[PDB]
Every structure is written in structure tokens, then in C-alpha cells.
Amino acid sequence: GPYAGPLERQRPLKV
Amino acid sequence: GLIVDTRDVEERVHVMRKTKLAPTVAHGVFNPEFGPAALSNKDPRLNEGVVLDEVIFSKHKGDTKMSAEDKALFRRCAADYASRLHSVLGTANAPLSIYEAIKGVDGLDAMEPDTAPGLPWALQGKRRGALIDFENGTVGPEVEAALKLMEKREYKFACQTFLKDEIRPMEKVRAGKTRIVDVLPVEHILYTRMMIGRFCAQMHSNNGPQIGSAVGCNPDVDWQRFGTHFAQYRNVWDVDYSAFDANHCSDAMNIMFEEVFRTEFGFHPNAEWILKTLVNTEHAYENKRITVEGGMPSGCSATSIINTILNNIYVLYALRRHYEGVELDTYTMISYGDDIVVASDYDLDFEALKPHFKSLGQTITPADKSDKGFVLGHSITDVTFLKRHFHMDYGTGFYKPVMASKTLEAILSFARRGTIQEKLISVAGLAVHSGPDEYRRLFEPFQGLFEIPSYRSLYLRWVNAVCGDAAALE
């Protein structure tokens, strides 16, 4: 696979 | 980007440390092919003999220089996108009064109360609150000073370099692919949003397939909005970049800023400057201090926006560089940083776009690692945006974001001591869309030890978010 992993971030924090 | 010089000088920035993530009761049940990133250049699991430093900075494979023509094409793609952008955001992109650049406005969140101040505030020992009164709303001692050296255009800085204490797939873990975070001097961040914080405000507010931005969205409800829009098109692509941030060629960044932040749109003539300062950077890794040309530093504020803008221009640029009279309405897309989803009724050949993206210095590839061939036909229920798949809710007909069970288990397998209870709640919100069975299973090994939100408790809360009326009308 590439450097692109599946388990990291999502958005900064809450809106 | 491009390293112009690896040097060793005076001081040493201690970033060396352990991981605070720790196995939970879940780990001994799912045993994920995931684990904390290598934080010590001598981590017991480093795949035999590989150096940490060696790997970490190996994303800077260089800085693609462009042909006067490709440049002019980009500048045209920018002048076109930057047009349809502000034309929808209005020119309400004026500057921000100090106060606002701290407490944020309608949209933009308030600056971070206290997190890594950067250089030279650390080779000096002290917090952000120990410089700027975050509770208040104004500067401080060296703060207003830097603020003026900046105001006059004299300012120059250095990027601090952090290590990403996060969970990663065991493969990348051993490969020593620990991600780094260039944390810049907090005054730079302040002046940045003072320059375009208002632009960013509107950006967040109008996120969608229109401006092609996902920044500021709430995936939990905007998934309906998005889902429907991308259900009209013939083809849907799930593009994937390799170090998207690090490979933005110097000419691209400089030309994007120039075309997207003109005073012609209401910005301050120091927006273009403060942004151009992001090109040539100096990074301090322990005793090392490196100069990096090109590529954008992942850490500064507005990062996601800048990258998004870029990602959008690249798609227009690349297509025009291969197709006949391609316009913004030829297709539709929406990106978050580097994550991207494109749609067009025309059967575009992304396989023939690798080169045109290469001219920018971006190596594109398909998400679903299958036969790594940019295929067609693909629909909204194939792609994965923000690690969330677009699933039709067989109960309300509305779309819902579903994260691969595996990926979820990984999140539940590692948590810093004692946070479990609050994370189990946060994470629980993400897992409700995996169904009732997978919900139970993902938390099954927690009963009698913690408070597990009833599947009902959450479904209902989500329902009164995607459509408040849909809850009552039912």
C-alpha cells in the first residue's frame, strides 16, 4: 500500500 | 519539497518520547494490525536496521519546477476557481481585528487555548497563555512586537517539528512511517487568520460540491447533502495522493496564493505575503535544523483550506491539460485537505492524468487498491471520504457515514490511560452507523466496566440531526 493509512484523523475537532 | 541543506547547529529540540496510547481490554479481542508510530529512533519494533530520521524526511523527494506554459495554465485554472469561489463567498474576505483573530467569528473556531507555542518560545520554556491572554482577547510582550515586525514585512521564522503520537497500520509502523507535524510560532498563526480568517469563516459556512470544500462540515449530517449530489453522476473517482502536502511545487503554491488572495477581492496585500512565507521553511528536529523549499507544512492553521483550494485547482489544471475546453461545470468535486471525490458524466480517463498531475509533482492513484487502474462506472457507494463510506440507511433512506469495522476496532484498541470512558462515547458516535450488531460487537468486551450508550440512544440523536422533522413526522 501507500503512505496513506486508514486509522488517523478526521476534521480538526468539534464544529 | 526540496531539502537545500541538512545542518547541525547549536541547540537540540527534545521531541524524543514514548507513546501515551495504551492497549485497552479491546486489544486482546480484536488484535488489530495497528499500533503506535515509532517515537524513538531506537524503537524495539523498527523493521530491522531502518533509521527514523531517514524515513521521516524522505517525503521531500524534491520540488517540481514548471514550464512557463504549465505555469500560465495553472494561473488560469486558479483565476477561474478563485473566481467561482469568491463569487459565492462574496468579497466579505476583509481582515480581522486582533480580538476576532483570537475568539473567532461566526464560523471560524476560537484559537487553541494552549498547545505547543513553537519557536523560539520553547527554547525559552513557556506556554501560549504565558504570552497571549487567551481568556482576554489580545496580544502580549513579544507578541505585539512580532506582530509589528510582521506588519512591516520584516518578520521571519522557523518551523518546530513534532512527531505524531498516533495509531498506524502495523506495516507502516515497522517501516517507521511516523508522521511529523510542523508546529509554527503561534504569532504566525494569529496573523494568518487576521489576514484570511474571514475568508476561512465563509469557507467553512458554505462547504459543499459547489466551492468544492469539505472543511467545516459535520460528516454526521452533511452526508445526506453530499450523498444525494453525487448520486446524479455517471462516474465517481476516489483519488489518492502520495504526500500531497509535501509535494506542492513551489511555483504552484506561489501562483495559487497570488491568484486566490488578491486585494481585488477584498483581502489585505499582506495575505499573499504571509502565505508565500510558507514556501521556504526552516525545520528544527532536535539538534538538526533543515531548510525545506516547496511543499506546505502540515501544522499551520488554514492548512486544510489551503490544501483543499490546491486540490481543487489541480483537478481543473490536470483535466484541461488533457481535455478539450474543460470548464468547472464539466465535473463536480469536494475535497478535505488531500482527501478527494470527483464526479463527472463524461467518462474522463484519470489513468491518462498521472502525467499531468506529475507536472505539478503529484502522483495520483486509485483508493481501492484493486488492480491500481483508474476504472469507470464507480458510484458513491464505492468511494471513501474522510475514512467514511457512503451507506444508504435502510431505515430512513438517508445516507450515513460508515467506517470500516477494522479501522474502528483499531481506535478502540488504543487509548491513553483513563480517557476510555469519554472516548468510548465519542467513538460510539462514529460506530452507530455500522449497524446494531457490529455496534454491540465493537463494544461487547466493555460491559460491566464502562457506560455503553444504547444503540437506540444514539440512532435517535442522529435522526434529529439529519432531519429534525423526520424524527417528529415519524
Side-chain angles (χ1 to χ4, degrees), chain A, chain B residues 1-171 173-474:
Chain A
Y3 139 80
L7 203 279
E8 283 112 14
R9 251 49 220 172
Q10 71 217 199
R11 285 252 65 202
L13 39 70
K14 257 63 196 307
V15 185
Chain B
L2 180 62
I3 320 295
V4 302
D5 187 87
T6 284
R7 120 174 52 215
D8 315 60
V9 93
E10 195 47 50
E11 289 187 296
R12 173 158 185 279
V13 186
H14 63 89
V15 302
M16 65 199 287
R17 47 196 289 285
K18 263 91 249 189
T19 171
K20 17 199 65 180
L21 285 163
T24 76
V25 54
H27 179 295
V29 181
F30 310 123
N31 289 86
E33 299 310 308
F34 292 85
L39 298 166
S40 177
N41 44 338
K42 48 118 234 54
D43 195 306
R45 268 166 297 100
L46 298 158
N47 254 354
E48 351 90 306
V50 200
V51 197
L52 194 56
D53 312 48
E54 189 73 41
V55 180
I56 281 50
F57 314 114
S58 66
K59 42 173 171 175
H60 304 78
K61 298 291 190 177
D63 164 31
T64 307
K65 303 320 305 168
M66 313 167 77
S67 75
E69 300 133 317
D70 295 325
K71 267 140 57 69
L73 172 55
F74 193 77
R75 185 174 288 277
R76 252 197 302 293
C77 294
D80 279 27
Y81 169 77
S83 180
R84 98 88 50 89
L85 200 69
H86 303 157
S87 182
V88 107
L89 299 174
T91 77
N93 310 295
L96 252 69
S97 58
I98 307 294
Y99 180 57
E100 287 141 30
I102 319 194
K103 286 293 204 299
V105 297
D106 193 317
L108 179 84
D109 282 316
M111 279 205 64
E112 259 311 308
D114 219 312
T115 27
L119 311 190
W121 317 136
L123 322 144
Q124 196 177 347
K126 45 189 172 192
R127 303 264 183 62
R128 276 139 76 104
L131 263 90
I132 295 181
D133 257 27
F134 270 88
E135 217 312 72
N136 293 20
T138 31
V139 288
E142 311 81 355
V143 189
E144 8 97 1
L147 162 277
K148 227 175 95 170
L149 343 172
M150 277 196 270
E151 293 177 311
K152 299 176 83 75
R153 288 259 186 74
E154 323 288 291
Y155 189 56
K156 282 298 163 61
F157 57 76
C159 299
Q160 170 146 189
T161 297
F162 262 78
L163 299 180
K164 212 67 157 59
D165 174 39
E166 76 200 322
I167 298 175
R168 295 217 77 179
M170 280 312 294
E171 176 151 13
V173 177
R174 260 117 54 187
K177 285 177 158 55
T178 300
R179 302 197 295 170
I180 57 177
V181 172
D182 325 286
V183 156
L184 297 53
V186 53
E187 58 275 14
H188 183 65
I189 284 67
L190 200 175
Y191 197 72
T192 313
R193 32 170 58 197
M194 259 197 75
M195 294 294 100
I196 58 182
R198 186 97 72 161
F199 168 74
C200 301
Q202 231 77 181
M203 270 276 89
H204 296 109
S205 331
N206 301 285
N207 65 98
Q210 198 68 308
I211 58 300
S213 157
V215 184
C217 82
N218 170 31
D220 220 49
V221 317
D222 301 333
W223 235 232
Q224 222 310 68
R225 237 215 307 171
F226 301 155
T228 46
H229 175 92
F230 286 76
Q232 277 94 295
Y233 308 66
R234 296 274 316 306
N235 305 283
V236 179
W237 290 270
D238 199 356
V239 198
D240 227 84
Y241 301 72
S242 176
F244 180 68
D245 324 307
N247 289 301
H248 299 311
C249 77
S250 301
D251 295 313
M253 284 166 73
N254 270 274
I255 281 54
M256 179 283 269
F257 301 149
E258 292 193 52
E259 294 296 271
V260 191
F261 299 70
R262 313 182 71 56
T263 44
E264 284 86 316
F265 311 122
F267 292 87
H268 184 288
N270 268 53
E272 193 183 312
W273 173 72
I274 196 282
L275 290 180
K276 276 188 184 293
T277 67
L278 294 160
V279 183
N280 301 158
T281 65
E282 210 182 74
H283 300 261
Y285 185 57
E286 293 195 302
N287 114 292
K288 293 264 192 176
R289 281 158 184 66
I290 349 166
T291 310
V292 180
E293 277 189 14
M296 213 207 81
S298 294
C300 65
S301 256
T303 177
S304 285
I305 276 300
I306 299 302
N307 284 60
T308 290
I309 278 54
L310 288 172
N311 198 177
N312 274 251
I313 283 70
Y314 289 163
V315 175
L316 179 64
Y317 166 105
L319 282 180
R320 282 176 165 174
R321 198 163 192 268
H322 189 89
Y323 276 62
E324 41 272 332
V326 216
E327 305 300 15
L328 285 172
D329 36 289
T330 301
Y331 57 89
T332 196
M333 69 173 264
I334 184 166
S335 56
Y336 197 99
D338 75 306
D339 208 312
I340 173 64
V341 179
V342 196
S344 165
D345 276 320
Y346 296 90
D347 299 56
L348 317 171
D349 189 13
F350 282 57
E351 273 298 0
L353 298 183
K354 303 230 187 183
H356 300 135
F357 274 95
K358 259 298 182 176
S359 61
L360 304 156
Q362 300 289 156
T363 304
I364 48 79
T365 139
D368 203 358
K369 86 295 290 100
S370 186
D371 91 346
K372 294 201 288 294
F374 276 120
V375 289
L376 311 80
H378 271 32
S379 64
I380 247 302
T381 67
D382 303 324
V383 297
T384 328
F385 195 53
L386 303 183
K387 301 154 195 293
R388 303 182 173 63
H389 192 16
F390 283 86
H391 270 209
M392 164 63 86
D393 178 54
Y394 286 45
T396 59
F398 299 111
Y399 297 90
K400 56 185 179 182
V402 299
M403 297 175 115
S405 297
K406 306 309 176 182
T407 259
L408 277 169
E409 301 184 357
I411 308 180
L412 299 166
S413 298
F414 299 105
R416 53 146 274 70
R417 79 171 302 102
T419 327
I420 329 171
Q421 185 58 90
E422 97 182 61
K423 253 59 180 179
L424 277 182
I425 304 175
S426 165
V427 179
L430 311 166
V432 65
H433 306 117
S434 282
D437 315 55
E438 209 80 327
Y439 183 74
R440 178 97 150 285
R441 190 187 74 72
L442 289 173
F443 294 94
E444 183 68 45
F446 282 99
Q447 316 322 314
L449 315 175
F450 284 105
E451 183 183 10
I452 299 71
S454 59
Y455 180 66
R456 202 111 162 61
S457 154
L458 295 180
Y459 191 76
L460 289 165
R461 143 123 47 180
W462 165 77
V463 170
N464 184 65
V466 55
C467 215
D469 315 315
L473 304 192
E474 294 295 309

